[PDB]
C-alpha cells in the first residue's frame, strides 16, 4: 500500500497472509472454512495465516492453516487478468474470535464514489521498493466505469473496477495483490493490478466481487 497508514494489530480480521516460506499474496476470510484471493496468487504449498499483524514476528493471536484445494476461476485469463478470483479451502476450520473474523459478501455491485478500505503487506513506494511487516490500509473511493476505462483503454472488462485517486500518491502495490477491498461492510473487490503503483491516471483495478457471488455460493456448497 503506498500513501496509506498502519492500521492497528487485527483492526482488519477478516485480512489474511498467505505463506509459501514467505508473504506472497493477501486474501479475505469469507467463512471459516474459506479464502477469497485473486486467481494470479495461485501456487502450490499455500499456508493461509490468520489473525496477524506484523508477519515477521509472532504476536499472539495468529492462526496458521495449511490449504487443502484451491479453485481457480473456470475463465480465468492469466493475460488480461479477467475473472481473477479464486476460492482457497482450509484444512482445518479457523477458530473465529474478534482478532480472526469473515467478511460479508456483496449483495449487489456498489456505487462509484462509495469509500472502501484496501489494505495489505504489499510495497509501500510507489518508486522502489520498501515491504512494511505490519498491516496498511487505505481508504479510497470506486471511480467511474468511464474514468476507468478512459484511464485503461481495450483492457477493462465488466468484472473489473478501479479505485483510488486519479492525481497519484495513494494505491495498492505488488504484495497487496488477491486481498480485500471492502465498502460499506461488503467485499467489492479484491487487489488484482495496475499499471505501476500510484503513478498519476493510472488507478488501482480490482476484481468485481459481486458478479462472482453465485459462483462462490455453489462452489463452497460443493466443496
Ligand atoms: N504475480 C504475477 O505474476 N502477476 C501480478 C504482478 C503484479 N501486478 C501488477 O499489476 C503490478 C503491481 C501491482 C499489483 C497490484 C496492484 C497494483 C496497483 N497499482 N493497484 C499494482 N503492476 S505492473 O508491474 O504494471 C504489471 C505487471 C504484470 C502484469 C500487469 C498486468 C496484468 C493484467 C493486465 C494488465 C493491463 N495493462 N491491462 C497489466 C501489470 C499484478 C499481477
Ligand atoms: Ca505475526
Not at 51 to 63: A, H, M, P, S, T
Amino acid at each position: 500500500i503506498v500513501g496509506g497508514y498502519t492500521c492497528g494489530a487485527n483492526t482488519v480480521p477478516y485480512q489474511v497472509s498467505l505463506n509459501s516460506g514467505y508473504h506472497f499474496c493477501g486474501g479475505s476470510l469469507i467463512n471459516s472454512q474459506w479464502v477469497v484471493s485473486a486467481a494470479h496468487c495461485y501456487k502450490s504449498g499455500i499456508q493461509v495465516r490468520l489473525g496477524e499483524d506484523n508477519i515477521n514476528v509472532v504476536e499472539g493471536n495468529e492462526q496458521f492453516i495449511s490449504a487443502s484445494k484451491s479453485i481457480v476461476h473456470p475463465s480465468y485469463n492469466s493475460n488480461t487478468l479477467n475473472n481473477d478470483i479464486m476460492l482457497i479451502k482450509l484444512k482445518s476450520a479457523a477458530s473465529l474470535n474478534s482478532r480472526v473474523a469473515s467478511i460479508s459478501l456483496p449483495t449487489s455491485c456498489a456505487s462509484a464514489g462509495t469509500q472502501c478500505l484496501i489494505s495489505g503487506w504489499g510495497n509501500t513506494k510507489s518508486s522502489g521498493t520498501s515491504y512494511p511487516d505490519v498491516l496498511k490500509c487505505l481508504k479510497a473511493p470506486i471511480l467511474s466505469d468511464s474514468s476507468c476505462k478512459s484511464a485503461y483503454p481495450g483492457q477493462i472488462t465488466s468484472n473489473m473496477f478501479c479505485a483510488g485517486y486519479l492525481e497519484g500518491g495513494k494505491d495498492s502495490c505488488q504484495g497487496d495483490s488477491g486481498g480485500p477491498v471492502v465498502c460499506s461492510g461488503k467485499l467489492q473487490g479484491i487487489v488484482s493490478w495496475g499499471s505501476g503503483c500510484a503513478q498519476k491516471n493510472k488507478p488501482g483495478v480490482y476484481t468485481k466481487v459481486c458478479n462472482y457471488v453465485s459462483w462462490i455460493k455453489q462452489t463452497i456448497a460443493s466443496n
